[PDB]
């Protein structure tokens, strides 16, 4: 993977509205709040899109409702990060609590990471699920 | 009294977000970068002062508002202006002050149409007004 740091030159940050548009349009989802990224499932799917085979897709819990399930999804994501040489520590313990500030900070970074690595490949996120 | 604007009124075309910010910024001499920043209610209050001088308690508007409760105070000033001028529009204050884009964009589209139906072309110095 191409790593993204606080010192990297990136595009402007997105509003919460435009960030949710990116997630929902790219993955054919229906999130209404950034806090919902606490489940880790969308991140797992974006890793599948970026680097097919990096993520254990069959193990991701796409309808997770409980914190321990969120943690399972994030452990899948961490394993994908390790596989791809991603030098970002994921603050899993914080994210899964569903607080806006922590989740918004991480998604801003993740979108920059995504944009640095996406090759434009076609992807059917419904078919993938 | 104000000319009211409804979904059935014939109006100008809607503006893009960038064109809407340019209107607010140029007219009030502000530097907003996002539609969501209209959550503070201050720009709407000043527009009412421009449209109908004396309609708004201008001295009570919080132009440097940073916290939600101050946003609500500005919107209550606006609601009082609307009542004074016979404006029939319900302001969705709770939705606006949270900075939600869709709600703020929908409201400002209406507000610009309302403004254009009512503006008489008077001179207005928005900086001098805020001082």
From Swiss-Prot, chain A:
Highest taxon of the lineage: Eukaryota
PTM annotation (N6-crotonyllysine): residues: 65
Free-text tissue specificity from the UniProt record: Ubiquitously expressed.
Keywords attached to this entry: Acetylation, Cell cycle, Cell division, Cytoplasm, Cytoskeleton, Golgi apparatus, Microtubule, Mitosis, Phosphoprotein
Molecular function terms from GO: cadherin binding; identical protein binding; microtubule plus-end binding; protein serine/threonine kinase binding; RNA binding
Record note on what altering residue 65 to R does: Abolished crotonylation by KAT5
Organism from which the protein derives: Homo sapiens (Human)
Protein's name according to its UniProt entry: Microtubule-associated protein RP/EB family member 1
Entry's Gene Ontology cellular component terms: cell projection membrane; centrosome; ciliary basal body; cortical microtubule cytoskeleton; cytoplasmic microtubule; cytosol; focal adhesion; Golgi apparatus
Localization per Swiss-Prot or TrEMBL: Cytoplasm, Cytoskeleton; Cytoplasm, Cytoskeleton, Microtubule organizing center, Centrosome; Golgi apparatus; Cytoplasm, Cytoskeleton, Spindle
Span within the parent record: 2 to 130 of 268
Biological role stated in the UniProt entry: Plus-end tracking protein (+TIP) that binds to the plus-end of microtubules and regulates the dynamics of the microtubule cytoskeleton. Recruits other +TIP proteins to microtubules by binding to a conserved Ser-X-Leu-Pro (SXLP) motif in their polypeptide chains. Promotes cytoplasmic microtubule nucleation and elongation. Involved in mitotic spindle positioning by stabilizing microtubules and promoting dynamic connection between astral microtubules and the cortex during mitotic chromosome segregation.
Residue list for modification N-acetylalanine: 1
Domain named Calponin-homology (CH): residues: 13-115
UniProt record, GO biological process: attachment of mitotic spindle microtubules to kinetochore; cell division; cell migration; establishment of mitotic spindle orientation; microtubule bundle formation; microtubule polymerization; negative regulation of microtubule polymerization; non-motile cilium assembly
């Amino acid at each position: 993977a191409v790593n993204v740091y606080s010192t990297s030159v990136t595009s402007d940050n997105l509003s919460r509205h435009d960030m949710l548009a990116w997630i929902n349009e790219s993955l054919q989802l229906n999130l209404t709040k950034i806090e919902q990224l606490c489940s880790g499932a969308a991140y797992c799917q974006f890793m599948d899109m970026l680097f097919p085979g990096s993520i254990a897709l069959k193990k991701v819990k796409f309808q997770a409702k409980l914190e321990h399930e969120y943690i399972q999804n994030f452990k899948i994501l961490q394993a994908g990060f390790k596989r791809m040489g991603v030098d970002k520590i994921i603050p899993v313990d914080k994210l899964v609590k569903g607080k806006f500030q922590d989740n918004f900070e991480f998604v801003q970074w993740f979108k920059k990471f995504f944009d640095a690595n996406y090759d434009g490949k076609d992807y059917d996120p419904v078919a993938a699920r």
